[PDB]
Design a protein around this ligand. Structure first.
Ligand SMILES: Nc1ncnc2c1ncn2[C@@H]1O[C@H](CSCC[C@H](N)C(=O)O)[C@@H](O)[C@H]1O
Ligand SMILES: Nc1ncnc2c1ncn2[C@@H]1O[C@H](CSCC[C@H](N)C(=O)O)[C@@H](O)[C@H]1O
Lengths: 221, 221
């Protein structure tokens, strides 16, 4: 199976089941990472090193955290590097928790957008960095392509989009646990290319548990 | 006479004669406006003010210019305000000219649809604004109602349809020059309500030559 259209039986249910799954997840780092909270530091440090290359130039004024959850990434990666951050997530309870989780530094979160990425239009020329981590599997192929194009139109000069996510060994696979798909590297690269985005960097995440999907970062604009 | 069914003798001929009329019209603003090219600025400027009331919320991703001709409206009203525009018109030569007329900004016209509105089905979830100007008189009452129902089905959330057109003092009047009708305000309102639309705003156009039909704008959803 090479596309979401093949594997998703009913698009409305694909989205509503995902919302229902996330509604019952603890609003904690462990919850955000599916019981793998302990990998957060290795993930964040690797993400920082990847992002720092572009800030040696990409601007430091504003970032957008997509599928931000309670703000694991906003706390440790984005807020230390960007003067302001916007967060978008489908799960209201996570964004409410974010306000506590993020503490004093979280007062620099400008907008908390409670919204599906498939329904979200980032404002034109607004963001230096748009971070999209462990959420692309929650969108259809068409919605992903379209969102990426809207993201591109939301970038400031020299701004970048970063996708960081699990890659499948082959094809497109439905996870009926959380109502998401996982796609292989070639599938993801094709969707990016078809969105008219340039691939500025690609990097496999190392030092990771073996029984979980491989993780790639892609910087785009 | 209170309906097109009481004035149009042969429906096929009503459509074919209009197509023939438009085929021999020069592809210019003066041709679009039947010799009143000079009213274009007062018209466009009034349309902009009318529409901006909804943009200040109706989205700005995409518009549909119905009976667009060479793109008089697409050029001055829609392309500046909307990220993409689709054009639909029965007259192939006008849409060809449009590619020249629109120039550089015209590169952001997504689709050129050569089709009668009576045969056109805008696809679900496509448009923030559907603009229908100086063309409703080319459709029968039933095709008009059905088209407007189709349009409603294609609107994005908060999206609107705008009709801007000549209104007759009374009844339904046939123009056997261009093979169109003009309908009074009551007739037009009846057709709107029957299409399951709500009236959002109505505005009479000011500063027009006294010898031409009154013009009204209706915003609908
Ligand atoms: N369609 C959708 N649009 C926006 N957010 C979604 C979504 N589907 C799932 N989500 C959110 O995606 C997140 C995935 S868990 C990952 C959280 C965060 N990116 C991190 O790495 O820490 C959850 O917060 C869930 O609520
Ligand atoms: N049935 C029909 N479906 C779609 N377009 C039609 C049509 N009958 C006539 N037209 C088109 O309607 C237009 C009317 S002239 C007005 C053009 C444009 N709305 C403007 O205001 O500048 C012409 O371009 C003509 O080709």
């Amino acid at each position: 199976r090479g596309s979401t259209s093949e594997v998703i039986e009913d698009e409305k249910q694909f989205y509503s089941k995902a919302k229902t799954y996330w509604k019952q997840i603890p609003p904690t780092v462990d919850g955000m990472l599916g019981g793998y909270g302990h990998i957060s530091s290795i993930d964040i440090n690797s993400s920082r090193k990847f992002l720092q290359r572009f800030l040696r130039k990409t601007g430091t004024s504003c970032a957008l955290d997509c599928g931000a959850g309670i703000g694991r990434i906003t706390k440790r990666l984005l807020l230390p590097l960007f003067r302001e951050v916007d967060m978008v997530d489908i799960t209201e309870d996570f964004l409410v928790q974010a306000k506590t989780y993020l503490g004093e530094e979280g007062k620099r979160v400008r907008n908390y957008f409670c919204c599906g990425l498939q329904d979200f239009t980032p404002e034109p020329d607004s963001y230096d960095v748009i971070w999209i981590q462990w959420v692309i599997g929650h969108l259809t192929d068409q919605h992903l392509a379209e969102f990426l194009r809207r993201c591109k139109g939301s970038l400031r000069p020299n701004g970048i989009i970063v996708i960081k996510d699990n890659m499948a060994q082959e094809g497109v696979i439905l996870d009926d646990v959380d109502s998401s798909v996982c796609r292989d590297l070639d599938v993801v690269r094709r969707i990016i290319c078809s969105a008219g985005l340039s691939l500025l960097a690609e990097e496999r995440q190392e030092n990771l548990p073996d029984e979980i999907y491989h993780v790639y970062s892609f910087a785009l604009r």
